[PDB]
């Protein structure tokens, strides 16, 4: 819900910048001279930035030394069919690259195997000026590096086709990270329109970083492989560590926990990592079922939670959810719902970007009169 709080960046802003340097006179000639005898080199551009340059394909050599010499000029007839096949192979990759660029207007993400093969990407990772821990982390999870990379078309001139590959840099690794799932808490009264609710809006990923917490509201952007979470710091907010206190005490005096308020009580399920939260309201029938014993639990009105140890599916109304069967340990902390604390008569509804202190101020401003 807090994705509107994020700032606006430019992902390719760096890469395009290098692309621009590539249009300056002499730069293509410099890169060409550097790769004259080698397929990998380090080149310092006019602005002084040092970049790794690689020659992945050499069509010039094949075309000018293995195709033209073997064809006659009087009644041309190629001696061998295999040559044709070889040409079709060698050109194929180039064609594919062009196709992708034409589809993506010169900026393609994720980077495909035509732009940068697995071996070339691994070699680039090995040659990057980073620590060995980062090299090991990204040498693995190569698919995530591909999904977080960009490919920018830069220039085609002086018989050289150059494009720019923009790879991620993970400066923060192995720090503790956790995920917060929130569902709605409504007072399960009988009358349809007499119910007031609250939901916490701070759902998403949190990660320790340099003494603060990086908060990613769109948990869909973050990619989870095993217990590793790859997240883009661009779509994040820097918060004090005290935000974690909101998990153990929503009314703690150190941090003001963000919440929303409403009068609509609909039943829904949030499938968490090790279980499922079920908010059952109204006449909706909510159950938890196992593939062997069938229905094993029936939820009453309110908010409940079931782990995935014995539960395989959860049915809320006409919806059926499959729970994640990832191994782990779940704990249930019993407590009085905080929704019951509020007086429905003076409860402020239809508040989206609010918090517990802001809701208290709103209630106290309704008791300004009277």
């Amino acid at each position, epitope marked *: 819900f807090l994705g509107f709080l994020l700032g606006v960046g430019s992902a390719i802003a760096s890469g395009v910048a290098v692309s621009k340097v590539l249009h300056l006179e002499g730069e293509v000639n410099k890169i060409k001279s550097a790769l004259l005898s080698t397929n990998k080199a380090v080149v310092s551009l006019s602005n002084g930035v040092s970049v790794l340059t690689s020659k992945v394909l050499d069509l010039k050599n094949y075309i000018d030394k293995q195709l033209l010499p073997i064809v006659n000029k009087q009644s041309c007839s190629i001696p061998n069919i295999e040559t044709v096949i070889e040409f079709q192979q060698k050109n194929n990759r180039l064609l594919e690259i062009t196709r992708e660029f034409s589809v993506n207007a010169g900026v393609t993400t994720p980077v495909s195997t035509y732009m940068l093969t697995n071996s070339e990407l691994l070699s680039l990772i090995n040659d990057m000026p980073i620590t060995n821990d980062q090299k090991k982390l990204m040498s693995n999870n190569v698919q995530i590096v591909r999904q977080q990379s960009y490919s920018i078309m830069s220039i085609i001139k002086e018989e050289v086709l150059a494009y720019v590959v923009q790879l991620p840099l993970y400066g923060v690794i192995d720090t503790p990270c956790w995920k917060l799932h929130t569902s709605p808490l409504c007072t399960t009264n009988t009358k349809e329109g007499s119910n007031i609710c609250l939901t916490r809006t701070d759902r998403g990923w949190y990660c320790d970083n340099a003494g603060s917490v990086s908060f990613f509201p769109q948990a869909e952007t973050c990619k989870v492989q095993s217990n590793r979470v790859f997240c883009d710091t661009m779509n994040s907010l820097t918060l004090p560590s005290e935000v974690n206190l909101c998990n153990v*005490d929503i*009314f703690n*005096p150190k941090y003001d926990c963000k919440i929303m308020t409403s009068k609509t009580d609909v039943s829904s399920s949030v499938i968490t990592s090790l279980g499922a939260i079920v908010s059952c309201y109204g006449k909706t029938k909510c159950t938890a079922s196992n593939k062997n014993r069938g229905i094993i639990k029936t939820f009453s009105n309110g908010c409940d939670y079931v782990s995935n140890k014995g539960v395989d599916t959860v049915s809320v109304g006409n919806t059926l959810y499959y729970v994640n069967k990832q191994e782990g340990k779940s704990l249930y902390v019993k*407590g*009085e719902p*905080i929704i*019951n*604390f*509020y*007086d429905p*008569l*003076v409860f402020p509804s239809d508040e989206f970007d609010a918090s517990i202190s802001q809701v*208290n101020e709103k*209630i*106290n401003q*309704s*008791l300004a009169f*009277i």
Partner: antibody
Amino acid sequence: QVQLVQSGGEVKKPGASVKVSCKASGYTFTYYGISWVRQAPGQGLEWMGWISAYNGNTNYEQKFQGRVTMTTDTSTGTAYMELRSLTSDDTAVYYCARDRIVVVTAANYYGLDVWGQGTTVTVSS
Amino acid sequence: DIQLTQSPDSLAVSLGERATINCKSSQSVLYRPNNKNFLAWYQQKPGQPPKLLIYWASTRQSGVPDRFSGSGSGTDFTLTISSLQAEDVAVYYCQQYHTTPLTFGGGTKVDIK
């Protein structure tokens, strides 16, 4: 289970001071206040004071002003009530009761819904 | 302060018969922001702390038997027992939490004839 457990009874001499403990269980201690009620033998309940477990705010009875001190220990979740200059009129049973919710403004007030078992204090020679 | 008075001081009711206790306050106990009468009825037995029976104007605490009921408003309130039983022999108090200090009632003792 929401409950309050108080310390055992005490025997004191006049002019001394008495400390009564009240530990809370089954609920978040810092979300509610604690009231202290005194009951003399063969007499009705007498309210002595109320201490907020959230920020330590205290409200004492006018008769007990300057004579009774209430403290809150959030680490152990225990309310302590101390009384000084005991006389032959202090001998009574003291109860700790859970009071209004202090973390939400104008929250639902159902009164003193949870009570302690009671501590008897006898002041005699 | 708001002083509370109870009537009668002592009550004697036969088994299975209605019992009535009246509580009157020197000042109104209505909480204007939520329109609630901040009065509570407790019962106490020998060797036991008071237990909350009625809160607000007329609301029953969870687990309280349905025979106990509250009524009244403004200045006079009433606690009613539909059918007095053996276990209902206790001292009943009315107290107001509208404003500090919390003044409890004088106390009414219920006995079986």
